[PDB]
Amino acid sequence: MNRHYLITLTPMDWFFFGGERTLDDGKSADYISHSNKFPQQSALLGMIRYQLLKQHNLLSQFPYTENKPTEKEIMKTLIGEQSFRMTERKAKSLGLGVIKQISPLMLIECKDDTSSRSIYFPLPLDDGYKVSFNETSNEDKVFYNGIECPIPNVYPASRKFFDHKTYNNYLFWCTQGNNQIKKLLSDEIWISKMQIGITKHVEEGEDNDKSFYKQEFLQLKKSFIYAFYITLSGESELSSDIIQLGGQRSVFRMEVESIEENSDIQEKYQTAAQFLTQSDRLLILSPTYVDNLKELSALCNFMWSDSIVFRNIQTTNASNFYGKPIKSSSKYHFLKPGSVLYFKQGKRKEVEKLLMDYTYLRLSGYNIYI
RNA sequence: CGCCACUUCAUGGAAAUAAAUCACUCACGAAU
User: Fold this and answer.
1) Is the CB of A328 under 7 A from strand B?
2) What is the DSSP string of A262-302?
3) Which nucleotide is nearest to A196 (CA to C1')?
4) Which long-range contacts (CB under 8 A, 24 or more apart) does A143-150 make?
């Protein structure tokens, strides 16, 4: 039937998950490139597809080449005809091969024990404060670009009011304790180094395009690994290997573990995130892509949200795999993890319906909440 | 007037003292 795996990635060296105004972008190519802390789920999909072809010896080698029909059909049945695409955001099927669903990438801490792994999540933006939202006729009201919404009274749940100077919840990641949420600073998880690189020969070149590039390489602290859950169609197999995930040939180690069958991985991820639940808000655990933010703000009053940029590399089975890849023509803005959507009385169901209507994005571990 | 010699052969003090003990300039430049 279907087969469920847990896939742990261990950084062998300093990795580089980059992208936005990255190098070789032109328009002041901006040699200084900073690494994103996580890869896009598209990178996860592509890595899975690349390794699936590696196991079956179906990769493209040598300069521009061709394909015979039967290997084309086996690539169809294994990986799919087309990469992760934003245009298929409302397709009810993943449009790929044996891959059905992947959980959002999760940060996992591996203590030196048989003891289980602690799952670390970004700290909710509302953690530490209470939002009361007093609404009995006009007593206070705010317009967000021309929409009526209640007033967000925010107090430190410890009265005073929200001092943005004290606000440091965006710098923390959380995990479950006995009954205390364990807060970890982002620096205690990711260490960064700036690298200076040049081309030695020196030929005719112009700045941002000849030499002298600086890249941010991230290292993940000792006992921390990246993980996700995958469902495969059952006629394939995933083998432990050494992978390339990210930019500048960032090399990782796959440990593929088979979890017991009949296990919906979405329920597993939500069980992991259960300790952050609050009855009055929806916690965004992974980037979300509501097609109308004004529509969402209609039913949510205070959206304690941030934004991340998403851009995808678009390739098919027959594409120049050695060349400037085709990037997604549109830049897609996603809701940062840890974002808080505060809804009206009731009305939770149709905002959840708006969030889950992107079933293709739900399957690629994006619009996940708790 | 005649005759005639012996003795002694460096001790004490001063044995280095003071002034200068590194100074100025350059402390990275150009292309990338």
Assistant:
1) no
2) S--HHHHHHHHHGGG--TT-EEE-S-B--S-HHHHHHHEEE
3) B32
4) A144/A297, A145/A294, A147/A294, A147/A297, A147/A298, A149/A297, A149/A301, A149/A302, A150/A301, A150/A302
| Nearest of A274, A290, A264 to residue A370 by alpha carbon | A274
**Burial track A338-353 (b if 16+ CB lie within 10 A, e otherwise):** bbbbbbeeeebeebee
CA distance A189 to A193: 14
Q: Is the CB of A197 under 7 A from strand B?
A: no
Distances (CA, A) of A68 to A6, A63, A75, A189, A337: 34, 16, 11, 47, 43
Please give the method by which this entry was determined.
cryo-EM
CA distances from residue A161 to A153, A165, A167, A302, A351 in whole angstroms, order as listed: 8, 12, 11, 16, 29
Check whether residue A202 has its CB closer than 7 Å to nucleic acid strand B. yes
* Residue A222: both structure tokens together: 């000792």
If we measure between CA atoms, which residue out of A183, A151, A155 comes closest to residue A301?
A151
- Rounded to 5 degrees, φ, ψ at A153 are -75, 115
CA of A178 to C1' of B10 (A): 108
Distance CA A169, CA A330 (A): 31
CA A78 to chain centre: 24
CB A192 within 8 A of CB A35: yes
Instruction: Identify the residue whose tokens are 């409302």.
Output: A90
User: Resolution of the coordinates in A?
Assistant: 2.9
Amino acid at A355: L
Tokens (6 digits) for A67: 């394909």
Residue with tokens 């899975």: A48
Residues 6+ positions from A214 with CB-CB distance below 8 Å: A31, A32, A33, A194, A195, A196, A197
Token representation of residue A151: 């007033």
Count CA atoms within 13 Å of residue A2 on its CB side: 15
Residues A98, A101, A103, A104: is their CA dihedral positive or negative?
Answer: positive
In angstroms, how far is B10 C1' from A61 CA?
A: 113
Q: Which nucleotide has the least CA–C1' distance to A206?
A: B32
